[PDB]
Design a protein around this ligand. Structure first.
Ligand SMILES: Cc1ccnc2c1NC(=O)c1cccnc1N2C1CC1
Lengths: 530, 405
DNA sequence: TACCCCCCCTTCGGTGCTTTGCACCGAAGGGGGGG
């Protein structure tokens, strides 16, 4: 009751509410009028604007919400259960009518005005408001700060109304202490059920079953339909993403591959055998429940990483072997061209960010890569990157680069001169090349851009070459793509080029400026342009 | 009194989120902020405050205690009208020829002057929690912040008052102030330079500026681009060098390449050696002579902004270029560590921006060759400076990287 | 006929050189956990 009130004002430049009155039928009026008059009589409540009446057998506002001082959110993040320390005793106390106890400010008491089709002004903080959670949480933590200051050994979490209190004192001692917590909350005019109405483990918080010694995801149900629509597939993939946090080995890429190219949410699309195998394996792994473990401050975090294929990675953060704390998957496709080392880098940095926000400290990785491969990748790459601290685990498949470009030219190998000139308008291109030994070739192409012909001229040269070859290109695009050393791409042409480059035992590339008459590159212009 | 501070006409405030921190850099922040609040520096703020700015904990050079560092780039962009227009100071051009400049920290000096009441609702921050276990402890500054561009502007009057005696006693040195940093430039020997530095330290301590490391602007050498030398040139080497004198034609009008192409008329294998003709040799010599001469047609313009590119050259080597307009460079450097990978980029960034402050006075907007997530995750662990530039990440540079071999 | 929050996925726009095509990142939609 004697709680300090946070002042609140409306948005500068406008006024408060302007919604008109909302008369309705007389059937639903009294059923709300009596209870409203009762809560007015209790004393918690006691100007052209007014609020329309909402009857449920509840006050709603949108103009006010849009014309209110903006606030700063108090709980933006949700505590993942993996980071909670192993508390021996846990108790839940659900405060009731919490928003009734929190008062309102003198200025805003005038603005809050509800009139039934009798008018009252809120002398307490209303519900369903934009500012309600921040104000209520601030008041609640102000109330609870003296108790935590006086008692350090207990741990208390406040989520909206519910409060979860953990302790290492004995069961009788824990009940004793929770009694003074109840009394302290009652002193500040906040209700709390006695020991008869208190909840028992497992506690179902935000989709998590919580125990004194283990955590688990709430029972996840998968749809079982002979045919699947768009919304059913989306619900599926969402539930699989949600459930991946504790069940190892779940892949959802194939299922997601169906959602493309369509926009209608009521359409029906037949599956594919790859998606059928995905579903079968997902159901097989989801058949039996698994449980996490609670963190211990004195143990060393370890986060292994494993590969699935086509750009899926799984990880299992744990401290004691065969006792997990968290699992997850990474499948984002960043960039139109990438290889496995870059994706391993992205997965490692994502894991570090999650472990920092959840546990506060970076774990010791165990990557499926060799030291020499990493070293040779980082030193020879244009960008800068650092993997914190990792050891080597020999669990195939491993990560390695397929084709290594050579720094120096090759003796005894042919030297191709490739280019390509495609008209922007007629969509007709020509990919040709010549060789130092006299071999010449030219190929017409239909419906290609001015870069496609130049890109697959290298493909022509590689296809018509031997194991050792030197190639001269006059476009920076293809040179950059090939030097990036990709393993996959959006377009299949780059995949063909990669397949050719893997076969060659030694390949060398070289850029040459164009449209100047430089060397033999001027010769292929006569073959490809006219 | 308190100098009134206002933003631009109808200019909004700092709305930036605080990304997570290590548990050590949160224990340290909690301890430092409790110490600061227990004697009046900071005051907790209620939920009605709608503005937030990031916060970090670093470790200063050759120190053990932790030091708070509050990012203020957004607030500085808001406030730029209050500092650039109101108190646009002149930059001492004599600081770029000093024998050796010493850097001292005067941020503590700002820990006494109060701050405007109306503006005080913008310097609000929050220390985060581990696992979102609890809502974060929030705070705002009462005294002037260290990191805001207007705080030097407010303290400038007292700074000049304190520095008039020392400047009058000895006019040889040059005094500059940027954020919490004071640069002192002397043409004196290092042995007596140390004595002068300790004398200035005592002078600052006497008048109430408690303060508990040397650059050599005369030894800062620009790096001209130089072609390689070899007795025998193959086709590949000629092709490499020719295009480099074609890209460099845009940078220098005096580079001509028409005779170096006379050696490349027909399809020839890369490995085969090619002799050098007299006209081509003359063209190569002239191009080398032009490359020796410095860049032409460039001049510093304080109205515009500086841009700094950094490229990784391998084996702990980095290059950097500071300019204002494309293909019109104002500087060129080469950092080297004769460690980590992000650590070297962080140190290079600090060196480049310190040099930019010493010569020009405004830090450049960096174009970093790093992953954005990797930078934002790792940049704090190796940052010992008490100020932060603005950086944008560059996806791809011209592939030749002609700046070094 | 509400919001707000964290996560994961596909889709569109705008801007930059990697040029009139391609690439990139942030914004939107849709699911999941809710209060
Ligand atoms: C929902 C929730 C959020 C944060 N922490 C907890 C809980 N609830 C628990 O039941 C719990 C279970 C195990 C360990 N800590 C727990 N607690 C902590 C307070 C002791």
């Amino acid at each position: 009751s004697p709680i300090e009130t946070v002042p609140v004002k409306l948005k500068p430049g406008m006024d408060g509410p302007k919604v008109k009155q909302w008369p309705l039928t007389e059937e639903k009026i009294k059923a709300l009028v009596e209870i409203c008059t009762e809560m007015e009589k209790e004393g918690k409540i006691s100007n052209p604007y007014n609020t329309p009446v909402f009857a449920c057998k509840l006050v709603d506002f949108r103009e006010l919400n849009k014309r209110t001082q903006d606030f700063w959110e108090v709980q933006l993040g949700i505590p993942h259960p993996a980071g909670l320390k192993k508390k021996k005793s846990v108790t839940v106390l659900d405060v009731g009518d919490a928003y009734f106890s929190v008062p309102l400010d003198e200025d805003f008491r005038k603005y809050t005005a509800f009139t039934i089709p009798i008018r009252y002004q809120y002398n307490v903080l209303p519900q369903g408001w934009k500012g309600s959670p921040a104000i209520f949480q601030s008041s609640m933590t102000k109330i609870l700060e003296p108790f935590k200051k006086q008692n350090p050994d207990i741990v208390i979490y406040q989520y909206i109304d519910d409060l979860y209190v953990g302790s290492d004192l004995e069961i009788g001692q824990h009940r004793t202490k929770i009694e003074e917590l109840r009394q302290h909350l009652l002193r500040w005019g906040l209700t709390t059920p006695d020991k008869k109405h208190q909840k028992e483990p497992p506690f179902l918080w935000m989709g998590y079953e919580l125990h004194p010694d283990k955590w688990t995801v709430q029972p996840i149900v998968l749809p079982e339909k002979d045919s699947w629509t768009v919304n059913d597939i989306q619900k599926l993939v969402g539930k699989l993403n949600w459930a991946s946090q504790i069940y190892p080995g779940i892949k959802v890429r194939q299922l997601s591959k169906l959602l493309r190219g369509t926009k209608a949410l009521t359409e029906v699309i037949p599956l594919t055998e790859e998606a059928e195998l995905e579903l079968a394996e997902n159901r097989e792994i989801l058949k039996e429940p698994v449980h996490g473990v609670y963190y211990d401050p004195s143990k060393d975090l370890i986060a292994e990483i494993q590969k699935q294929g086509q750009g899926q990675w799984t990880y299992q953060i744990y401290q004691e072997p065969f006792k997990n704390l968290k699992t997850g998957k990474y499948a984002r496709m960043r960039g139109a061209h990438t290889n496995d080392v870059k994706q391993l880098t992205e997965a490692v940095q994502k894991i570090t960010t999650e472990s920092i926000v959840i546990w506060g400290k970076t774990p010791k990785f165990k990557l499926p890569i060799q030291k020499e491969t990493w070293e040779t990748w980082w030193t020879e790459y244009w960008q800068a990157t650092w993997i914190p601290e990792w050891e080597f685990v020999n669990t195939p498949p491993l990560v390695k680069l397929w084709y290594q470009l050579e720094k120096e030219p090759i003796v005894g190998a042919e030297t191709f001169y490739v280019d390509g000139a495609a008209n922007r308008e007629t969509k007709l291109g020509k990919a040709g090349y010549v060789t130092n030994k006299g071999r010449q070739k030219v190929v017409p192409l239909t419906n290609t851009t001015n870069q496609k012909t130049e890109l697959q001229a290298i493909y022509l040269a590689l296809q018509d070459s031997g194991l050792e070859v030197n190639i001269v290109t006059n476009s920076q695009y293809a040179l950059g793509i090939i030097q990036a050393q990709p393993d996959k791409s959006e377009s299949e042409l780059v995949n063909q080029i990669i397949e050719q480059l893997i076969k060659k035992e030694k390949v060398y590339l070289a850029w040459v400026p164009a449209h100047k008459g430089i060397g033999g590159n001027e010769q292929v212009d006569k073959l490809v342009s006219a | 009194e308190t100098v009134p501070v206002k933003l631009k006409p109808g200019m909004d405030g700092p709305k930036v989120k605080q990304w997570p921190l290590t548990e050590e850099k949160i224990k340290a922040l909690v301890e430092i902020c409790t110490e600061m609040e227990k004697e009046g520096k900071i005051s907790k703020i209620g939920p009605e405050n709608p503005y937030n700015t990031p916060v970090f904990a670093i470790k200063k050079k050759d120190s053990t205690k932790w030091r708070k560092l509050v990012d203020f780039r957004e607030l500085n962009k808001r406030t730029q009208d209050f500092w650039e227009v109101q108190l646009g100071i002149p930059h001492p051009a004599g600081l770029k020829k000093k024998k050796s400049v010493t850097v001292l920290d005067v941020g503590d000096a700002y820990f006494s002057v109060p701050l405007d009441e109306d503006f005080r609702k913008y310097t609000a921050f929050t220390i985060p929690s581990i696992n979102n276990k609890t809502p974060g402890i929030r705070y705002q500054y009462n005294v002037l912040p260290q990191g805001w561009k207007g705080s030097p502007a407010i303290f400038q009057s007292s700074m000049t008052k304190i520095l008039e005696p020392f400047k009058k006693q000895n006019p040889d040195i040059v005094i500059y102030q940027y954020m919490d940093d004071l640069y002192v430039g002397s043409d004196l020997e290092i042995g007596q330079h140390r004595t002068k530095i300790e004398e200035l330290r005592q002078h600052l301590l006497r008048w109430g500026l408690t303060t508990p490391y040397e650059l050599h602007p005369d030894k800062w050498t620009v790096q001209p681009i130089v072609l390689p030398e070899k007795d025998s040139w193959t086709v590949n080497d000629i092709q490499k060098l020719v295009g480099k004198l074609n890209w460099a034609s845009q940078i220098y009008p005096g580079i001509k390449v028409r005779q170096l192409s006379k050696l490349l008329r027909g399809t020839k294998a890369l490995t085969e050696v090619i002799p050098l003709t007299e006209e081509a040799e003359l063209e190569l010599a002239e191009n080398r002579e032009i490359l020796k001469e410095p860049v032409h047609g460039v001049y510093y313009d304080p109205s515009k902004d500086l841009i700094a590119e950094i490229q990784k050259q391998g084996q702990g080597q980095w290059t950097y270029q500071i300019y204002q307009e494309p293909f019109k460079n104002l500087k060129t450097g080469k950092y080297a560590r004769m460690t980590n990978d992000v650590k070297q980029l962080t140190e290079a960034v600090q060196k480049i921006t310190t040099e930019s402050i010493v010569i020009w006075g405004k830090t450049p907007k960096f174009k970093l060759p790093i992953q954005k997530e990797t930078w934002e995750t790792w940049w704090t662990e190796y940052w010992q400076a008490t100020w932060i530039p603005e950086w944008e990440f560059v996806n791809t540079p011209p592939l030749v990287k002609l700046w070094y071999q």
